[PDB]
Amino acid sequence: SRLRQEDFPPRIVEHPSDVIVSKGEPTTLNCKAEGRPTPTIEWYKDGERVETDKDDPRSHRMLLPSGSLFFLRIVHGRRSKPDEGSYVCVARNYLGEAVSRNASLEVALLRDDFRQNPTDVVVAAGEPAILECQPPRGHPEPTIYWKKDKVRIDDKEERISIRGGKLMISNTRKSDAGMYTCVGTNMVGERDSDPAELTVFERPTFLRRPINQVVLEEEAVEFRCQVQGDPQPTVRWKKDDADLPRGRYDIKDDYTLRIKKTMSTDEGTYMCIAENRVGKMEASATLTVRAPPQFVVRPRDQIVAQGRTVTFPCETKGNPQPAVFWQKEGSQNLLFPNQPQQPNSRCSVSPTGDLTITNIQRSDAGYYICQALTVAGSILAKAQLEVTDVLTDRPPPIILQGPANQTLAVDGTALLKCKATGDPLPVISWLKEGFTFPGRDPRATIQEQGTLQIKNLRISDTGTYTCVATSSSGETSWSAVLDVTESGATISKNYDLSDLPGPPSKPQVTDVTKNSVTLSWQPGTPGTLPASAYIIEAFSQSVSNSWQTVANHVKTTLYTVRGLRPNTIYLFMVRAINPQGLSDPSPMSDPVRTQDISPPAQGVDHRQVQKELGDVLVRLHNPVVLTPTTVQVTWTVDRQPQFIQGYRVMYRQTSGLQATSSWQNLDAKVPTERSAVLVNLKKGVTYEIKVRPYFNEFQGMDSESKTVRTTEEAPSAPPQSVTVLTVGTSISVSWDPPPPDHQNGIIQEYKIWCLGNETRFHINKTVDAAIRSVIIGGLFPGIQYRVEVAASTSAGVGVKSEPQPIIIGRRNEVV
Numbered sequence: 001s002r003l004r005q006e007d008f009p010p011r012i013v014e015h016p017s018d019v020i021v022s023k024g025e026p027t028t029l030n031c032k033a034e035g036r037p038t039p040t041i042e043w044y045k046d047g048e049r050v051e052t053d054k055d056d057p058r059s060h061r062m063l064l065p066s067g068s069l070f071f072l073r074i075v076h077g078r079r080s081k082p083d084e085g086s087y088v089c090v091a092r093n094y095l096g097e098a099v100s101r102n103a104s105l106e107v108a109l110l111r112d113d114f115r116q117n118p119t120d121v122v123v124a125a126g127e128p129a130i131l132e133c134q135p136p137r138g139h140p141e142p143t144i145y146w147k148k149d150k151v152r153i154d155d156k157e158e159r160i161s162i163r164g165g166k167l168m169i170s171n172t173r174k175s176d177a178g179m180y181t182c183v184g185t186n187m188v189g190e191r192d193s194d195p196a197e198l199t200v201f202e203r204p205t206f207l208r209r210p211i212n213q214v215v216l217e218e219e220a221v222e223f224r225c226q227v228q229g230d231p232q233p234t235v236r237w238k239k240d241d242a243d244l245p246r247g248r249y250d251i252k253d254d255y256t257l258r259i260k261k262t263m264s265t266d267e268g269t270y271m272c273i274a275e276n277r278v279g280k281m282e283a284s285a286t287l288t289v290r291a292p293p294q295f296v297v298r299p300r301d302q303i304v305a306q307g308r309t310v311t312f313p314c315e316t317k318g319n320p321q322p323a324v325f326w327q328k329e330g331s332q333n334l335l336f337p338n339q340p341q342q343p344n345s346r347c348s349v350s351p352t353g354d355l356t357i358t359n360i361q362r363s364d365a366g367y368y369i370c371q372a373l374t375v376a377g378s379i380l381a382k383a384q385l386e387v388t389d390v391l392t393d394r395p396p397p398i399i400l401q402g403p404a405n406q407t408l409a410v411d412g413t414a415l416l417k418c419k420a421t422g423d424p425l426p427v428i429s430w431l432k433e434g435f436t437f438p439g440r441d442p443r444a445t446i447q448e449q450g451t452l453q454i455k456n457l458r459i460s461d462t463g464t465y466t467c468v469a470t471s472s473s474g475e476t477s478w479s480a481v482l483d484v485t486e487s488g489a490t491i492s493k494n495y496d497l498s499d500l501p502g503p504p505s506k507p508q509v510t511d512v513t514k515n516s517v518t519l520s521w522q523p524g525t526p527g528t529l530p531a532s533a534y535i536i537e538a539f540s541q542s543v544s545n546s547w548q549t550v551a552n553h554v555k556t557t558l559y560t561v562r563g564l565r566p567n568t569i570y571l572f573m574v575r576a577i578n579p580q581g582l583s584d585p586s587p588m589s590d591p592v593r594t595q596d597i598s599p600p601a602q603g604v605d606h607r608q609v610q611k612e613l614g615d616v617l618v619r620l621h622n623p624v625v626l627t628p629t630t631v632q633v634t635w636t637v638d639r640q641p642q643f644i645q646g647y648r649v650m651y652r653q654t655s656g657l658q659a660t661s662s663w664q665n666l667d668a669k670v671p672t673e674r675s676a677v678l679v680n681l682k683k684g685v686t687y688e689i690k691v692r693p694y695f696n697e698f699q700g701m702d703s704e705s706k707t708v709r710t711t712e713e714a715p716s717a718p719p720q721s722v723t724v725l726t727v728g729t730s731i732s733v734s735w736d737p738p739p740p741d742h743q744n745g746i747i748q749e750y751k752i753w754c755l756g757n758e759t760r761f762h763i764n765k766t767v768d769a770a771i772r773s774v775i776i777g778g779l780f781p782g783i784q785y786r787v788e789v790a791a792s793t794s795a796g797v798g799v800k801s802e803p804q805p806i807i808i809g810r811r812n813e814v815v
């Protein structure tokens with residue numbers, strides 16, 4: 001109470017501010033006041049007076065010189081909380097008081113259980129992974145970071161970036177797999193989260209890939225395939241994108257695929273497919289099967305008569321399918337199937353491979369050879385053709401049925417039959433036990449119809465009688481034994497007319513060697529009793545002049561007649577034996593010669609025909625254009641070798657729409673060709689020409705390329721649809737692109753004519769191709785003109801389009 005006009009009541013200059021601080025740690029509540037006299041400061045938490053170290057030297061709080069309340073260590077418990085509250089500093093003197101603002105001191109907090117614990121994540125290498133986390137509640141609010149396997153991880157990246165609660169890695173690798181914890185700190189401390197693991201699976205990868213293999217039929221083959229990935233991928237096989245037709249395939253545990261028995265049909269592109277959670281991956285390999293060519297049917301020799309038709313079969317199997325082609329021994333020319341010739345030759349080859357010659361000439365006779373040639377090898381077989389004329393040789397006369405063993409009583413009259421055939425027609429003669437008959441005795445005489453007649457029988461006439469047919473073509477004989485006794489004409493089996501089984505099937509040749517020929521025939525049976533066995537007669541212009549037996553008592557219908565003269569032609573005849581006697585003779589066999597087949601042999605090697613076709617140099621001259629739709633191409637050969645089917649000539653478009661694309665293919669199927677005319681091509685356009693000599697599936701080397709363009713033709717249809725804008729005086733011209741084919745060449749220019757109301761003034765403007773729309777210059781005022789656009793070419797004169805007699809106005813307007 002010492003008044004002075006220098007003394008002023010107290011003013012708090014520095015106010016204490018709210019603070020959160022941790023237990024057991026120092027802190028200072030800031031306070032600073034002005035006064036005169038200087039004031040005494042004292043603090044109040046909620047209401048009560050704060051006991052500093054002045055009020056008791058045992059206390060932990062301390063009022064500073066400044067006035068700030070400084071705690072040494074903050075004190076806090078569960079029940080007694082002495083420092084947690086709402087502080088205010090109060091400075092006073094005799095003039096008055098001064099209470100500060102509120103400042104609350106709060107003890108720091110940090111719970112255990114997280115608001116959101118990071119959860120396990122599964123990703124595929126290269127993909128982004130997002131881990132999220134939310135720390136426990138705290139005061140202050142906590143802030144998080146991430147540990148990988150108890151190692152801090154920095155966002156010092158563009159792939160790694162921590163944002164809010166979220167952590168993300170992009171382009172994940174297996175480096176990133178492991179335990180991830182999210183750690184939330186504070187000024188209390190830090191709590192770790194439940195660990196979330198990141199698994200980084202990857203797509204399947206090939207360790208051992210299957211490799212292409214080439215293998216001969218019926219062998220065994222396998223393709224290996226080893227994979228890797230996370231998770232472990234499952235392997236499966238497919239062929240040509242289809243599943244493997246069950247059978248010879250076998251899937252091993254190590255995933256190897258084994259084909260036990262290889263087959264032309266097993267060929268293809270096999271592929272190994274690996275698949276897990278992340279997706280799939282496939283790698284293929286090819287299998288190729290080599291089947292060397294082999295004859296299914298091979299041609300055998302034929303003896304056939306002039307003017308007929310011959311067919312030599314040649315069927316051929318292999319891989320690739322072999323191409324059949326023929327050649328006449330001692331002749332350079334070859335014959336190929338689909339190839340046509342002029343309607344003047346009679347040779348011709350089936351797609352099957354069968355060779356056929358119509359209307360045979362003596363000229364055609366000789367050996368022929370069908371040949372097969374692939375990369376898998378080569379084969380051939382030759383067969384002989386023998387042609388026969390009007391009657392190069394006629395067969396010797398034939399006795400159908402001769403006399404049978406008659407047995408007649410004395411004094412009677414005996415007739416003996418004998419049935420002949422042949423060309424020329426035969427003379428029938430007789431013999432008795434060998435000598436001439438009838439000789440001297442008048443009682444016996446020779447009949448025309450083969451029968452021999454004896455009036456007035458006697459004992460003296462019993463014997464062996466022989467019927468002999470004779471022409472210029474040979475002679476055959478048939479003898480029987482006659483018996484003449486007094487009584488003996490005992491009715492054992494009287495005379496037979498047509499009781500005898502009728503002829504059998506004309507004998508069909510099967511196999512033939514040098515001393516064998518196998519025959520086939522079927523029964524006949526137009527007769528009486530059943531046949532027991534067979535008897536084969538035969539003939540040869542060489543070995544004999546008459547018909548001989550070559551096997552008797554044959555109990556089959558497919559017999560091999562053994563032991564014959566080699567390189568000899570033979571004809572045959574079959575008969576049936578039965579108790580009644582013998583059958584009539586079957587018709588003659590078809591001529592056959594005794595030779596051993598020329599067994600299949602190896603042809604020329606594929607490499608060596610390749611080598612020949614390679615060295616062939618086709619010189620092309622220069623394409624000569626016929627019309628703008630036609631070019632005749634002419635080449636020449638250095639030296640044409642034996643093995644060549646023809647020339648394959650190829651051209652490509654190198655102008656306008658779709659240039660330098662594929663080649664148009666058309667080939668000359670006849671090797672002696674030297675010229676070819678192309679069809680339906682584009683006028684004006686330039687084309688590149690290549691000539692290649694080709695064999696079968698085989699191909700030679702290309703000739704020097706020539707390029708030549710078609711002669712150019714003016715268009716057939718111009719662009720239409722003429723539009724006229726209004727000026728504001730001068731007419732306008734506008735058109736739509738004219739058609740591609742109707743262009744008839746490369747567009748040159750565009751000509752506009754204006755022969756309108758003025759028939760002694762026509763406007764002429766000559767632009768270029770690129771031009772689309774243009775306005776006309778010097779136009780006569782008022783006068784109504786006509787507009788006629790034209791497409792043009794390098795020919796010149798184009799084609800007029802849609803006329804437009806549009807009405808024009810005056811000057812600088814259209815009225």
Ligand SMILES: *[C@@H]1O[C@H](CO)[C@@H](O[C@@H]2O[C@H](CO)[C@@H](O[C@@H]3O[C@H](CO[C@H]4O[C@H](CO)[C@@H](O)[C@H](O)[C@@H]4O)[C@@H](O)[C@H](O[C@H]4O[C@H](CO)[C@@H](O)[C@H](O)[C@@H]4O)[C@@H]3O)[C@H](O)[C@H]2NC(C)=O)[C@H](O)[C@H]1NC(C)=O
Nearest residue numbers: 404405479480481532533552553554555577578579581582
């Ligand atoms: C007019 O008269 C003549 C004159 O004899 C008679 O022709 C004789 O016919 C027989 C046919 O059997 C021939 O002799 C005998 O051939 C036997 C074959 O047996 C098979 O034939 C029967 C009947 O078809 C079958 O069913 C059976 O399965 C047999 O397979 C052979 O086994 C005998 O031949 C013997 O010949 C001599 C002996 O002379 C021996 O060296 C041999 O080893 C063998 O044993 C059997 O004798 C006979 O060849 C014909 N005679 C002659 C010599 O010309 C007919 O009655 C009639 N004409 C005709 C043309 O048949």
Ligand SMILES: *[C@@H]1O[C@H](CO)[C@@H](O[C@@H]2O[C@H](CO)[C@@H](O)[C@H](O)[C@H]2NC(C)=O)[C@H](O)[C@H]1NC(C)=O
Nearest residue numbers: 045046047085086087088099100101102103104
């Ligand atoms: C400081 O602390 C109080 C809380 O104890 C604050 O809240 C005020 O409460 C009083 C009643 O005690 C009210 O009259 C006010 O309206 C509240 N304040 C405002 C404006 O928010 C207040 O900030 C301070 N109180 C004092 C000393 O006036």
